[PDB]
Write a protein that binds this ligand. Structure first.
Ligand SMILES: Nc1ncnc2c1ncn2[C@@H]1O[C@H](COP(=O)(O)OP(=O)(O)O)[C@@H](O)[C@H]1O
Ligand SMILES: [Ca+2]
Length: 340
């Protein structure tokens, strides 16, 4: 399978095999063909990739060329977080793959993106009604298009929502060709395709692809062998929880459950220091009502005292509304403030 690509893809809604879906009577100029498949290519990650989300840029800092996972169940602000990242990230180009959701949920995500952001996005969209084959190819189409723009010297953000639903489509395609169930309903081809997909993002001499893949968590206790494999491959993971989202704490990122394997390689030692102390002050906060309620009060307990003192500053730092905008300078300055 070869798809047609070019700069004219920018600002466009594109199907799972790369074809314009909008109603224009004049067709875009897409003069190049590129295969969907890319045999394997090495660079290190040493530059910070800024998302413009304080909790992440401050505490779980990304790197140019990193593979990042966002794990979220239903109704925890996944889409809002993803919108914020598109609107705030330091990328020249964003290639989005929106895979497996109904047309309503796609449009609700798109309404989060203003004109200035859309003008630098390729939007690869394959809703749940589309054939499994098309939903599967969407992940390759999107990655190839990101490769195309990387090859132009662009710092590209590849955003795939979701790898979970890519894998379901790849599964249905595989089982159809005769493959048996090996683990959790998934055939062998799906598993072999994951590293091949993810090995294609990374830093580069010309440009880069930094990639974010979402993993949808189900509200059951059924194993997800796709999530397992992705966890082992990623250079970072961001975990959203229903517990935080129920507090109207957004983004609903559980800092203790999240991590960046590249952060220490991309921030100053002092920034790493303040982040660790911020994380401790988050983890050791306990509602003061729990002690007042039993005869108030410190000791003698110094760390947990700061946590109370800093609660508002910390919560106002990690919580962040959809149109709150935060440069890397201001995020870092704010971070030092919260741990004083
Ligand atoms: N960072 C945020 N700032 C303000 N409101 C938010 C934020 N995240 C979620 N919300 C509120 O909760 C709702 C859920 O967000 P959304 O991204 O649509 O969740 P889901 O991943 O279920 O689509 C939003 O419509 C919004 O009103
Ligand atoms: Ca598991």
């Amino acid at each position: 399978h070869k798809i047609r690509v070019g700069d004219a893809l920018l600002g466009r809604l594109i199907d799972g095999i790369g074809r314009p879906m909008e109603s224009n009577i004049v067709a875009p100029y897409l003069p190049f063909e590129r295969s969907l498949y890319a045999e394997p290519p090495r660079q290190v990650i040493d530059q910070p990739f800024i998302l413009g989300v304080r909790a992440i840029d401050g505490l779980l800092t990304c790197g140019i060329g990193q593979r990042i996972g966002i794990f979220a169940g239903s109704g925890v602000g996944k889409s809002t977080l993803l919108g914020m990242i598109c609107n705030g990230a330091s990328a020249d180009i964003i290639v989005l793959a929106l895979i497996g959701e109904r047309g309503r949920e796609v449009n609700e995500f798109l309404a989060l993106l203003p004109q200035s952001t859309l003008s630098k996005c390729v939007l690869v969209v394959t809703t749940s009604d589309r054939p499994a084959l098309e939903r599967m190819k969407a992940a390759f189409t999107a990655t190839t298009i990101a490769e195309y723009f990387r090859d132009q010297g662009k710092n590209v953000l590849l955003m795939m929502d979701s790898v979970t639903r890519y894998a379901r489509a790849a599964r249905d395609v595989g089982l159809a060709s005769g493959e048996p169930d090996v683990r959790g309903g998934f055939p062998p081809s799906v598993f072999s395709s994951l590293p091949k997909l993810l090995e294609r993002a990374g830093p580069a001499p010309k440009g880069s692809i930094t990639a974010i893949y979402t993993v949808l968590l189900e509200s059951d206790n059924v194993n997800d062998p796709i999530g397992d494999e992705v966890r082992s491959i990623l250079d970072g993971h961001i975990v959203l929880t229903r517990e935080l989202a129920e507090e109207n704490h957004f983004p609903a990122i559980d800092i203790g459950l999240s991590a960046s394997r590249v952060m220490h390689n991309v921030v100053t030692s002092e920034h790493l220091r303040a982040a660790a102390e911020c994380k401790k002050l988050i983890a050791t906060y306990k509602n003061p009502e729990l002690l007042i309620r039993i005869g108030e009060y410190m000791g003698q307990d110094p760390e947990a005292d700061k946590a109370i003192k800093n609660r508002k500053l910390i919560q106002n730092f990690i919580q962040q509304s959809t149109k709150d905008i935060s440069s890397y300078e201001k995020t870092i300055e704010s971070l030092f403030k919260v741990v004083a």
